[PDB]
Each structure stands twice: as structure tokens, then as C-alpha cells.
Amino acid sequence: FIYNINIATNGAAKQLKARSLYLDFMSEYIADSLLDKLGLNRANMLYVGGGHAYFVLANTEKTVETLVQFEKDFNQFLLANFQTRLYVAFGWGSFAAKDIMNSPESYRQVYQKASRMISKKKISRYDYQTLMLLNRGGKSSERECEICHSVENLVSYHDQKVCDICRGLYQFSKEIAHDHFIITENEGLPIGPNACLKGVAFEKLSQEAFSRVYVKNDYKAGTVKATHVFVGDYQCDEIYNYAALSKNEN
RNA sequence: AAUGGGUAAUUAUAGCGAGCUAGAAAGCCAAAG
Numbered sequence: 001f002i003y004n005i006n007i008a009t010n011g012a013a014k015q016l017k018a019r020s021l022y023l024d025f026m027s028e029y030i031a032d033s034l035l036d037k038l039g040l041n042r043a044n045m046l047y048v049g050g051g052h053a054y055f056v057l058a059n060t061e062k063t064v065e066t067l068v069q070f071e072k073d074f075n076q077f078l079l080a081n082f083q084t085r086l087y088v089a090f091g092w093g094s095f096a097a098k099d100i101m102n103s104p105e106s107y108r109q110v111y112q113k114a115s116r117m118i119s120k121k122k123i124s125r126y127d128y129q130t131l132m133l134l135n136r137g138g139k140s141s142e143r144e145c146e147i148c149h150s151v152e153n154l155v156s157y158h159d160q161k162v163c164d165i166c167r168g169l170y171q172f173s174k175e176i177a178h179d180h181f182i183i184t185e186n187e188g189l190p191i192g193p194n195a196c197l198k199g200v201a202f203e204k205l206s207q208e209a210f211s212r213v214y215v216k217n218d219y220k221a222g223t224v225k226a227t228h229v230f231v232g233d234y235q236c237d238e239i240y241n242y243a244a245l246s247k248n249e250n
Numbered sequence: 251a252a253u254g255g256g257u258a259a260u261u262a263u264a265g266c267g268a269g270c271u272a273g274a275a276a277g278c279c280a281a282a283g
């Protein structure tokens with residue numbers, strides 16, 4: 001999805017910066033919104049990274065059914081507007097107080113129990129109804145999104161035929177430089193079930209109406225009382241100057 | 251003494267054996283959007 005960019009693409013690297021940043025907010029938000037379908041918060045998440053995020057949850061039935069139902073919810077969201085290019089696969093290993101110095105073959109042997117369930121669910125993706133609804137036919141499409149070859153919701157953003165996600169990514173590339181990224185319900189790129197992402201300035205938080213706010217690269221607590229993400233980014237200049245600034249002063 | 255004749259050595263020696271500048275640019279594309 002990220003290196004779907006090719007030769008003769010409208011976006012140079014803003015369509016690549018804003019695309020590898022967007023999936024990282026999606027990986028952040030799956031981790032966040034999974035923890036309030038449960039009763040938990042950010043402490044229980046051991047790590048979040050490039051789509052991978054390890055947790056510590058409770059070995060009980062009301063959590064496992066919440067895991068399965070939220071997994072089906074987010075995969076319905078990914079099928080609604082990414083069409084089997086993105087698939088999130090949960091997986092959970094039950095363990096006692098065995099991550100404590102049967103000392104060698106107890107810790108990693110249950111950390112790998114979740115990776116086996118992921119590899120089993122990554123390999124047998126869907127079920128009956130959600131694949132019969134896939135290849136149901138019924139579409140007289142003439143055109144397609146020339147970035148990702150999708151069909152639904154075609155617009156003419158800068159006289160090229162692009163889709164709903166790949167116009168939201170240009171809008172997010174105009175909004176990428178901000179520190180604050182809020183989740184609304186109907187604005188910008190969708191990142192979940194009834195949950196969309198929008199980049200916002202600081203003093204526009206009273207104008208906008210959100211539910212959860214992320215602040216990027218900040219250790220001060222701030223005013224919005226946000227969730228602190230940390231994405232590495234830097235821009236000294238635009239890309240086309242990087243050859244011309246390759247000279248010395250002489 | 252005349253008379254017959256020439257015979258030996260060197261066949262090039264000492265050097266420099268290339269130096270410096272340029273080492274791909276400008277367009278299409280990409281950017282500008």
C-alpha cells in the first residue's frame with residue numbers, strides 16, 4: 001500500500017510521507033480503540049510499531065469475544081474502502097506468571113503462541129458471507145482510481161480520476177505538518193468504524209469537534225489533554241532543492 | 251730494399267616516455283499541483 005506509488009505519480013513523496021504516516025496512525029488507533037472496547041488504556045500496550053502492537057490483556061471470555069468482534073469490525077472497515085489490501089489479524093497467547101526467571105522454555109514459548117495464531121489467521125483470511133459479498137459482481141465501471149486501481153467513489157482531483165482514500169491522502173499531505181491530529185466522524189481519511197482522521201492546528205480545536213486528539217512529538221502536556229504519539233519526521237527544504245543545495249558555498 | 255696491399259675500433263650515447271581542463275549536462279518524466 002505504501003510503495004503503491006510508481007513512475008508518473010501526482011504526489012512526489014507527500015503521497016508517500018502522508019501514506020506511511022497514515023497507516024501508523026491506523027496502527028495507533030487500532031491499539032487505542034481496542035483498549036476501550038475493553039476497559040483498558042495505554043499501559044497495557046507493550047509496543048506499537050509498523051502495524052505490530054503487542055498487548056497484555058485478561059484471560060477471560062468477555063475479553064476474547066471482544067477481541068474477535070472488534071477484529072471483525074475493523075476488517076469490515078478495511079473491506080469497505082481498501083479491498084483486501086489491508087488485513088488486521090489478531091492473536092492471543094494465554095499465560096500465567098511465567099515471564100519470570102521451566103525457566104528457559106516458558107517465556108518466548110508463549111510469546112510465540114500469539115504469532116502462530118496470527119500466521120494461522122493471516123493465511124485463512126475471510127469467511128463465507130464476507131467473500132460471497134466480495135465477488136458478487138454488479139458493477140458497470142468505466143474508470144478507476146489510477147493510483148490503487150480501485151473503483152468506488154471516483155473524483156477528479158487535479159483532473160485525474162482518483163478515489164476516496166487517495167484524495168484524503170492529498171488532503172492529509174496538506175495537513176501533515178501540524179502537531180495535532182484529531183479523530184472526527186466525517187472529515188478526512190477514515191481510520192475505523194465511524195472514525196475518521198483530520199489534521200488540525202492548535203487553536204482550531206475549539207472550531208472542530210472531535211473525540212480523541214493525538215499530538216505528535218511533544219513531551220509537554222499541552223492544553224488538549226491528548227495522546228502523545230512520536231513519529232520521526234524532518235524537512236529541511238522541499239525535495240527538488242536537495243540537488244541544488246548539494247553544492248558548497250563555492 | 252723495393253713490389254703488393256690496408257688493417258683494427260666506434261654504428262649512436264644520456265634524457266624526457268606525456269602533462270593540464272572537461273568526466274556528461276539540458277529536456278520529456280518528475281516537479282510546479
Ligand SMILES: Nc1ncnc2c1ncn2[C@@H]1O[C@H](COP(=O)(O)OP(=O)(O)NP(=O)(O)O)[C@@H](O)[C@H]1O
Nearest residue numbers: 002019020021022023024025027049050051052122
Ligand atoms: N507506516 C509505515 N510507513 C513506512 N514503513 C512502514 C510502516 N509500517 C511498517 N513499515 C515497514 O514495513 C515493515 C514490515 O513490512 P510488512 O511486510 O508489511 O510486515 P507485515 O506487517 O507483517 N505485512 P506482511 O509482510 O504482509 O505480513 C516494517 O519493518 C517497517 O520497516
Ligand SMILES: [Zn+2]
Nearest residue numbers: 145148163166
Ligand atoms: Zn486510490
